[PDB]
Design a protein around this ligand. Structure first.
Ligand SMILES: [Mg+2]
Length: 664
């Protein structure tokens, strides 16, 4: 069923992806690299005292605080959903090998018995209504760019001035590039305007992953993570193999002279892709106005801030179903990209813009280094973008693509299994739009709160409620998938956007509360994804600009967890045992140093201003800006703090660009 073409780095097609500069050339050739992360300034993730600490703490917390999750996956009591062994990884050392990204997910979807298009006309109207409501009356805003982010293919620039020039040029030339693509002249669009080429595959660490302690043997077992070899990836699974990657860390002693304590493993590695910036800029210029619309007009379903903001909505429900989606990005359907594009054309969107958007979701992928002596291969031909990878992580609108798919998928699930009496309200496009507009504002007896693959489905009192309970039972039974679109199940320990829904004896949403996940505090404090990057002078460009600041927001973020105090005391006791120092004093010193350093970056902050004007969100984001890419948005952050992390292209340039894209 057609193998994807593959080109080695030596091939002209791969050489054309990398500009004639040191950074781009280094990116093309970069071999497999691994090493201990600098967890905190002067502390490596493999430091013997640190691993001793992690061993004692993970064992103690699991012992004293076993998971309190009922038969229906509802969290109660202590607010704990699993063991605490997830911290037991040699951070910076990945599992081997990482996966080769699947060039086509068509067979993957078909074999999982998932649909190759909307099943019914109702579903087709709902997906199309989502496009109409999300992309209609948009207002232009400046194009915001993350400081220190790469432009990837072909320049690999990290310079803000260069990135602004690239983005401004992209907005000027997007029309000419899109029109070339409409003529099938992809090579010309890429050669002239750097719009096309490929995604650059970077493998990111998932610092904590499931580990269990086998009571029979007293030995730890890491969760097997399936990976595709090159043959499997190019054939979409027709040939080659899907096998468990090796998380065994024994090798670190032999290779690096690192002592590996019992039950410590190599980290899970996830594919992540970096888009060609010239192609992403015109997409981002439309994506941000879309987010502003859905987070304002449809704030009920889409705008999530605090645990109390979520709680106010959920408390009004008679039933709350916390869903789980299996491997969302890889299963994301190309038919949805095509349906979205077709609908945007029907709405009157510039055909050249729609073509750029379509192309961004079919683009080839350049594989770097999944393992030693592997990689440096382009999958797919940039002259005719035709890949079906699912949803590329570095595409300019990935969050919206997952949100569009999932929001409709969950609504269809509620219609099919609980509310057939609402089907008569969805007869054509105008009625589909009116119904969806009402549903997304939380005005119907069936409701939802969602973001990409995370959601909580609700039922108020009414005709759909009884069906809601049967659907929940069907999910518990786990024999039948309730959706034709994606693999849906219930979450084992229901949570929404980091906050655990803590139920009491009644097991009803009315008396349930949202609390911070204590395991996430431990993940963030002891297993960060990145090192401190102490060599990167400009802190605003680091992956973790001000790690010390997270101490100041900790009580606000995690204080509501039933075992908050217990965990902090266990940390103090274990850190004393391992380092002969106070963890609290260590964090207070880091908080002081980072507070002082922060004022250098904030124009409004005097030489020793303090954190007085900053919110807990501001502090969590300054310690981890990745939270601004999956948890929160621009409007949730103070303006003076957003400026530390982002820079923008003027609204004058974007306003002119947006006028040319949008209908009449
Ligand atoms: Mg969830």
């Amino acid at each position: 069923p057609r193998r994807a073409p593959a080109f080695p780095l030596s091939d002209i097609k791969a050489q054309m992806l990398f500009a004639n500069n040191i950074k781009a050339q280094q990116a093309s050739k970069r071999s497999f690299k691994e090493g201990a992360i600098e967890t905190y300034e002067g502390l490596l993730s493999v430091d013997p005292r640190f691993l001793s600490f992690k061993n004692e703490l993970s064992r103690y917390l699991t012992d004293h605080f076993p998971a309190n999750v009922d038969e229906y996956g509802r969290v109660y009591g202590n607010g704990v959903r699993t063991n605490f062994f997830g911290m037991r990884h040699m951070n910076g050392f990945p599992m081997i090998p990482a996966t080769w990204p699947l060039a086509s997910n068509l067979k993957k979807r078909a074999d999982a018995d998932l649909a190759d298009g909307p099943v019914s006309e109702r579903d087709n109207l709902l997906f199309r209504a989502a496009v109409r409501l999300m992309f209609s009356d948009l207002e232009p805003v400046p194009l915001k760019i993350r400081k220190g982010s790469s432009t990837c293919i072909p320049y690999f620039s990290n310079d803000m001035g260069t990135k602004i020039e690239i983005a401004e040029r992209a907005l000027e030339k997007a029309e000419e590039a899109g029109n070339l693509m409409l003529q099938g002249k992809f090579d010309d669009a890429y050669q002239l305007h750097q719009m096309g080429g490929a995604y650059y595959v970077v493998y990111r660490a998932q610092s904590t992953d499931a580990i269990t302690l086998d009571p029979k043997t007293g030995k730890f077992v890491s969760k097997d993570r399936m990976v595709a070899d090159f043959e499997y990836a190019v054939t979409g699974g027709e040939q080659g193999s899907l096998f468990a990657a090796s998380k065994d860390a024994s090798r670190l002693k032999e290779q690096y002279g690192i002592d590996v304590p019992d039950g410590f493993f190599c980290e899970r590695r996830r594919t992540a892709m970096g888009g060609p910036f010239a192609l992403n800029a015109p997409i981002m210029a439309v994506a941000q106005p879309v987010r502003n619309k859905i987070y304002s007009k449809y704030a009920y379903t889409f705008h999530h801030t605090t645990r109390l903001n979520k709680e106010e909505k959920v408390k009004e429900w008679s039933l709350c179903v916390a869903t789980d989606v299996s491997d969302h990005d890889t299963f994301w359907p190309g038919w949805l990209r095509d349906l979205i594009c077709d609908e945007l054309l029907n709405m009157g969107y510039a055909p050249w813009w729609v073509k750029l958007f379509e192309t961004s979701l079919k683009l080839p992928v350049y594989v770097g280094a999944p393992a030693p002596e592997q990689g440096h291969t382009l999958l797919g031909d940039p002259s005719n973008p035709d890949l079906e990878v699912g949803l590329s992580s570095g595409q300019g609108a990935t969050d919206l693509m997952g949100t569009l798919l999932m929001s409709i998928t969950y609504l269809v699930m509620q219609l099919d299994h609980t509310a057939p009496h609402l089907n008569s309200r969805i007869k054509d496009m105008p009625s589909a739009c009116r119904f969806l507009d009402s549903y997304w504002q939380g005005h119907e007896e069936i409701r939802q709160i969602s973001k990409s693959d995370d959601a909580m489905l609700g039922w108020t009192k009414g005709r759909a409620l009884v069906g809601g309970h049967r659907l929940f039972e069907m999910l518990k039974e786990g024999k039948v998938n309730p959706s034709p679109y994606m693999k849906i199940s219930y979450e084992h320990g229901g949570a929404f956007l980091g906050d655990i829904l803590l139920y009491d004896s009644r097991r009803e949403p009315g008396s349930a509360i949202f609390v911070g996940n204590i395991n996430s505090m431990l993940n963030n404090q002891f297993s960060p994804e990145y090192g401190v990057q102490s060599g990167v002078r400009d802190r605003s460009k680091r992956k973790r600009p001000f790690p010390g600041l997270a101490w100041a927001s900790m009580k606000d973020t995690y204080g509501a967890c039933p075992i908050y105090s217990d965990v902090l005391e266990a940390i103090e006791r274990c850190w004393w045992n391992a380092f002969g120092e106070s963890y609290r004093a260590y964090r207070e010193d880091m908080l002081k140093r980072d507070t002082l350093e922060l004022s250098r970056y904030v124009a409004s902050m005097a030489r020793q201003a303090g954190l007085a004007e900053l919110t807990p969100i501001d502090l969590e984001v300054l310690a981890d800006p990745n939270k601004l890419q999956y948890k929160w948005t621009q409007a949730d952050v103070s303006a003076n703090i957003h400026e530390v992390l982002m820079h923008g292209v003027s609204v004058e340039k974007t306003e002119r660009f947006l006028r040319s894209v949008m209908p009449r």
